[PDB]
Amino acid sequence: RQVTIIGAGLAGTLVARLLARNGWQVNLFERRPDPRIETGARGRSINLALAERGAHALRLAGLEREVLAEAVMMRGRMVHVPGTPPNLQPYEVIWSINRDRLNRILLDGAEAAGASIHFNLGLDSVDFARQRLTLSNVSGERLEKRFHLLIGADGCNSAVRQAMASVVDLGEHLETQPHGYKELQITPEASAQFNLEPNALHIWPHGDYMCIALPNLDRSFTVTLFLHHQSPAAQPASPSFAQLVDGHAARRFFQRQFPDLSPMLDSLEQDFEHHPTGKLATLRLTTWHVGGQAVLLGDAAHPMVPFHGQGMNCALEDAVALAEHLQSAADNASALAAFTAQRQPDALAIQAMALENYVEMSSKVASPTYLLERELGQIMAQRQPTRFIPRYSMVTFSRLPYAQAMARGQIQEQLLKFAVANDLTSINLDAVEHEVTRCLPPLSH
Template identity: 40%
Template sequence: MKKEKINLLGAGLIGSLLAIYLRKRGLDVAIYEKRQDWRQVDTSGEGRSINMALSYRGWKALERAGIKDKVIPYTQPMYGRRIHDEHGDTFFQPYGKENQAIYSISRNAFNKILLDEAEEQGASIYFQHKVEHVNVAKREVTFSLADGSSKNIAAEVLIGSDGAYSALRNAFQSQLRFNFNQQYVSHGYKELSIPTTPEGDFAMDPNALHIWPRGKFMLIALPNLDKSFTCTLFLPFEGYKVSFENIHDEQDVEQVFKTHFNDAYNLMPTLLQDFKRNPTAALINTECYPWTDNNTLLIGDAAHAMVPFYGQGMNCGFEDCSILDGLVGKYGTSSWDLVFGKFQKGRKPDTDAICQLAMDNFVEMSDNVADPKFLIRKKIEARLHELFPEEWVPLYSMVTFSEMKYSEAYAIGKLQEKVMDRVMSDPLITQNWDSLDYEEILHQVVVAGAV
């Protein structure tokens, strides 16, 4: 049998990991990438999020691809959120049980590791190949190259791992009976930074994701290996006093930071330069269906771009790769339409669920985390989890520290939410939360789940 050649569009994190998986299956793999080889050039300040939060699903997918151990040294564990209030006081909110953490990693460094590995495993990588046109019915791709020339390929199998603005998805949109939804959220973001102290140390707790929640806007910071922090400012584009449209000059920047993020401000000597230099980026959510047609497939952000508020975009894309690889193992490569069909059918409810959770989580991150009642709610949930470790797992933990299907986590989360709403409706809850009948609360979820 002729060995199929798999052509991937996009050599980002998802495309690189998928290439490793497919090479390990003995398949021929070529990756076409629009940008130049970023392993040789500095691509910081591109306006893309430069720190990723790697969690359980991502780690499992790396492990199965045999690349986990190479990644570990580049990560910095964050065991919880450190909340900064308006007075500069902070408190710590663990993400899960002791030792459960999410891991900060630089996108650039991470992509280099994966791409090197893909290449080492024998994948061919073609940089500066920009997709100009895809004919889905013929699986023909026309690229424009750096020298202005163009190149055509006819692919046997074509996979779009080319992100939220996928060229393959664009072709699907105009060439198939294709349902597609793209939605921008009201907020944009800008990257800023907190350097090391003069002594070369972390300027804040290095084992936390720092959040300055301010209701309609927020600042977050993730630690880097070089002991600096990468900060991301999330503001509404317009319609509010504190919004990108109302920041016209350096004075406005300073005023926002001094007023709302004063402790961070004191750690940000390059704030004004960063603010000016770094672009204001938008946040898109996309959902679409089908993901496959005629031996082509969308995967990762190309199939389901989500907003970053659950820290799952990359983890979900890695899980995509792992699931797809499992299906290749199970069904073989004699019918890609079968494999891709199984993939989209099984996976779509899960990516719908995580897209929705990511959208909803902005409110939790920017607002609730600072609310005393929300903190009690979290404490009750933590207690429930402590008492009934198998029966009550908080939604965040199901999503972040397990491989439970996202759609299942979503459904259980909805049940828990209903029960917790009822628990929290007790006007004396702030006083008596410690002495609740926890068994009875758990029972409510069990009953609700049964009907």
């Protein structure tokens, strides 16, 4: 009945609330300070896309209305490319939520449910044999604490995950990507001056690099630049973080490549030199738990590239699943095994689907095969909105488990490919629709 959670982020704080109100004694430890303590100057955090499946996880926790109150409705996407004014491409919605706003709400929810939360305390080591762990603060205190069940919700660099290696082989494989990212900020004045639409997701596509911006209720926007770390050996002058040696270089790059975005980025030079360049990676594990003693949740279990906007959504789903299993199972070891069996297939799937979105960020001309496929898929979905559901729509706008969206997507892509092989005018749409009904079962099977 006792549980210790490391990491008061999105997954850890949600699972604290779900367990605490299910009668667990919950202690939650966080390395950062309490964002609920009002200071004189609020810091900036990123805005995240919350999709239907994440919103539904919050509804099960009884916190959806709270979060929605501070979330910006995004009705569609606005693509910005030179030579056209952007116009809204309508989506059904995606909510833009501020990370720290969400976190404060989750924290209040966890505490209201009876969890004890401890801030400014980082997990440094775990001794599984002696079931003790040690927390450290900046005051030099080294706090040794006893634990029964340990939930690692401590993010993509999990200290819990690292500790688990000492006692079990996690079968880790880290796959890195050549793009990094940089977080930047459009202020409310700038967005208003350039009439940036608050109720939309904004994209600046540019072949091998790109910017995406999500809104905040105060009309500021957080912008993410995705760009190669280094210029390719054979394409040595192409843009990369390696060339952008300082803020002035960054400014010249934005001026040249993102002319209409550069004016909105007032602290670009500042932001570029301070904010570290983030890495893109996928980490996969064969095992998420050590018997009944510890389990990994969210980014701690399954780091993924941020290209389908689903990491937080997955983490919130994870929390719901972990608390469901901990209640309905015989013992903790069985719960953790069952949890891993449910969610690890979903995690691998979204990790893969995220990478597939990522690889499209290319200046390579799209193969006419892939183009005809997508165009044919659109037609089929129109004719049988029943069965043929585009995979992105299954992921982003439904609650269908990721593994099942990936499976239906495979059946669908395969059908499209055999149909398109060897322009669309020669393709018999009746023959294709016949194959769609023969090969793709309705959702009710």
